Structures are given as C-alpha cells and as structure tokens.
Write a protein that binds this ligand. Structure first.
Ligand SMILES: C=C1C[C@@]23CC[C@H]4[C@@](C)(CCC[C@@]4(C)C(=O)O[C@@H]4O[C@H](CO)[C@@H](O)[C@H](O)[C@H]4O)[C@@H]2CC[C@]1(O[C@@H]1O[C@H](CO)[C@@H](O)[C@H](O)[C@H]1O)C3
Ligand code: NA
Length: 403
C-alpha cells in the first residue's frame, strides 16, 4: 500500500540508524526500498523484507570516484562528490521506481540522511516529500549553529559551507527525525527544534550466545570496538595493546581485518599477548554484546549512534576520536552527560589504562556507571506505551500518511 524510500550515507554511524528506522517503519505497515551506493553495501540477506537498489557508483565508476581510500578520513570524499554530481542520477532512479510501481502501491516520501542535502531539490522536482534523518545528537547541531572547537570550525571553510547547506535543506524538508530521546538532551530540545521550521520527531533508533562471555563475572569485561570505517597506524595499535595489558582487565577486543594499516589483521601483536585475560575477534553483534551482564565498559569511537546504543543498555564508556572528529562530542558525553571518559592525548598506554580502571574498577568512577543506568531507565520509559518516544513515533507514522 505505502512504500518509503530511504537513502543513507554509507558509513558506520549513518547506515545502522537508517536501517533501524527502516525496521520501525516496516513494522508500522510500510514497504521499504533502500537506495545505497555499491560502496560499503550492507548485507542484504540480513534484511530480506527490504528491497535494495544500488545507485550512483554502478559498474563503470570511472574517475577519482574509482580511486579514494576505502578506509579512514578520506573515504568520505565520496559524500561531497555525490552532493555535487548525483542529482540527475538520483532523479532517474526515483523515476524508474515510480514507473515500475504496482497499481495498489504508492510512494509516501523519501527519507534521506541530512548530509544528502542535494536530495531536497530533486524530491521537490518530482513532487515527492522528503524527510531527513539526523544520525547524530541535538547538541552537535546546537554547537555548530551558534569555545575552542567552535573556533576550530570557524576556521574550517569546507566544514562550514557543508553545514550551511545541510541546515538550509533540513529546514526546507517536510520533517526531521532525530536519533535521540527527549530525556537524554532535554536542554537542547527547545532551542534546536525552534531553529528548524520543519517538524521534529525524536526517536532513539538503537532501541545469540557468547560462551566465553557467559563464563565471566558481571561487569568484568572491557568491550573494545572502533567500528567498520576506522584505521590506525601500527604504533597506535601497539599502544592500544600495551594499554589493555597494563589495565589488567579482561577484554573482548573486536579488530576488523584492515584496522591496522599495513597488516591483514593483528600481525604486530607481540608473542604471548592475550594471556588469560584477553579475547580477540573479527566481528560480533554490538547491541547483543552490550546487553550481556559480563560487560563492565565499552571503549568506542566517539560516534553518536555507538554511544546511544551503549547508554540504552546502561554501559559506561571510554571515548576515542578518529579522523576529523571534533573533541566536542566526547566532551559532551564525558563532561555533561557524564557517562564515560574521553582520551584527550591520542593513544598513550598510561592514559588508556587509567581510563579503563576509572570506569571499571575505581570507587570514584561508579557515578559514571550509575549515570549510564539512569539514562537506560529513562530510555525504557520513553519507549513505554505513553512515553515521549512512543508518542513521537506514532505521530510520525500518521503524519507520513497525511503527506
Ligand atoms: C557539522 C558538520 C558537518 C559535517 C558533515 C560531513 C562532512 C564534514 C566532516 C566535513 C568534511 C566532509 C564530510 C562529508 C566528512 O568528512 O564527513 C565524515 O565522513 C566520515 C567518513 O570519512 C564519516 O565517518 C563521518 O560521520 C562524517 O562526519 C562536516 C563538518 C563537521 C560536521 O560535524 C561533525 O559531525 C559528526 C557527526 O555527524 C561528529 O562526529 C564530528 O565530531 C563533527 O565534527 C560533519
Ligand atoms: Na591466551
């Protein structure tokens, strides 16, 4: 009857929330098409109820779109190229799908990542309403729209121009879905919502057996995962390893193959690393691990969705920055939400070990765990029938029908 088209940005903290949004909407009775680049294409057999359609970089990519690291900060150069060049092809794919539409179905709206600001005038050209998904925090929006990091950004010409384009095309959209809940960022709400005429909807999107974990005492394991796009130099990998050892905590460390530049997997690890404490794996399902009673803390990339998934399960964090990430976001988590510790000095064994001990062992760290557990309760209540997130979602579903 009603189909929604979703068009995510193809990177860690963008894909997952858009897919989760797809699942929510599927469960409210919408059919789902996902438009996605061939680059970082998700695993489609894991979402058999969605139609996937690959666009924008099909077979003959040709140019620099064909070059370009697949990992680290420069991978994202794909995004400005598509914002600049992708309009006519996005338009064609939208038309092809409307032409093949079955007689009993229609397309309700297009939902894009906010970073895909080019999509607004394309949607407008076809008389299709576009909603936007903000995959990151309300605070992040507030900090850029209105002290040291703010002046770092005022010095950054590309960052500022992209942000102005995002902002204008978000305001022009028919609605904004934020990956958050009201009780998490209650001071940001009024100000952010108000700056944007398009109606806002806050929905916290993050809401199998581990034999080795099952044998560990509660809150005894450090879970370490930097996600799918990140990379480090060999020196940094070794400092991460030295830090884990010196913490003397038990750890489950997820290391993607390719995470260490210049090696397939973990060749640089010293002989007899691991011992009786550590476990290393290539991949695990993160939400499931975070829900396990063995996990005492989560050392993560400072991405917002990772962070939200952790507080939604009551797990405190250690935060590391990668690529072009601004310290802003980990500061907010550390110093305002107070649900983890930020590593200020890159990768250094002493700081690493201290942060692990602070969150997992130290008496004076327990406030952090507690803060995390309060947030988890609030998330639970918000999603409760009657709660603010439950009602936001119900209103969005009805609004989509009214477009
Ligand atoms: C206000 C914002 C607009 C903004 C839009 C994306 C954009 C860029 C980062 C500028 C460069 C090109 C481009 C396209 C870029 O490289 O984008 C990055 O591409 C990576 C893949 O190489 C992805 O992994 C990252 O998610 C993506 O940011 C730009 C400026 C700063 C930025 O805020 C940042 O927002 C982030 C939250 O969204 C927050 O984590 C950062 O701390 C914060 O500084 C983001
Ligand atoms: Na061992």
């Amino acid at each position: 009857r009603r189909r929604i088209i979703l068009f995510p940005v193809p990177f860690q903290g963008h894909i997952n929330p858009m897919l989760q949004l797809a699942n929510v909407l599927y469960s409210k009775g919408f059919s789902i098409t996902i438009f996605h680049t061939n680059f970082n294409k998700p695993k489609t057999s894991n979402y058999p109820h969605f139609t996937f359609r690959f666009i924008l970089d099909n077979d003959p990519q040709d140019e620099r779109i064909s070059n370009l690291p697949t990992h680290g900060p420069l991978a994202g150069m794909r995004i400005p190229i598509i914002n600049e060049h992708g309009a006519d092809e996005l338009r064609r794919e939208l038309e092809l799908l409307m032409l093949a539409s079955e007689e009993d179905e229609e397309v309700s709206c297009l939902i894009t990542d906010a970073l895909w600001y080019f999509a607004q005038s394309v949607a407008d050209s076809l008389n299709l309403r576009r909603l936007v998904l903000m995959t990151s925090s309300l605070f992040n929006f507030h900090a850029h729209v209105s002290k040291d990091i703010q002046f770092g950004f005022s010095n950054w010409k590309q960052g500022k121009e992209i942000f102005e384009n995002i902002t204008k095309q978000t305001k022009a959209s028919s609605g904004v879905i934020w990956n958050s809940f009201k009780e998490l960022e209650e001071s940001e709400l009024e100000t952010v919502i108000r700056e944007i005429p398009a109606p806002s909807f806050l929905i916290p999107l993050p809401k199998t057996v581990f034999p080795w974990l099952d044998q560990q005492p509660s809150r005894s394991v450090l879970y370490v995962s930097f996600g799918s796009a990140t990379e480090v130099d060999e020196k940094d990998f070794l400092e991460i390893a030295r830090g884990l050892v010196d913490s003397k905590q038990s750890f489950l460390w997820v290391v993607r193959p390719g995470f260490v530049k210049g090696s397939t997997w973990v060749e640089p690890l010293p002989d007899g690393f691991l011992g009786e404490r550590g476990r290393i794996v290539k991949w695990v399902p993160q939400q499931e691990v975070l829900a396990h009673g063995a996990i005492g803390a989560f050392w993560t990339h400072s991405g917002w969705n990772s962070t939200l998934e952790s507080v939604c399960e009551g797990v405190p964090m250690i935060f590391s920055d990668f690529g072009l990430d601004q310290p802003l976001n980990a500061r907010y988590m550390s110093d305002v939400l107070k649900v983890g510790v930020y590593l200020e000095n890159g990768w250094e064994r002493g700081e690493i070990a201290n942060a692990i001990r602070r969150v997992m062992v130290d008496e004076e760290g327990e406030y952090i765990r507690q803060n995390a557990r309060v947030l988890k309760q609030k998330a639970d209540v918000s999603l409760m029938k009657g709660g603010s997130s439950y009602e936001s979602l119900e209103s969005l579903v009805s609004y989509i029908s009214s477009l």
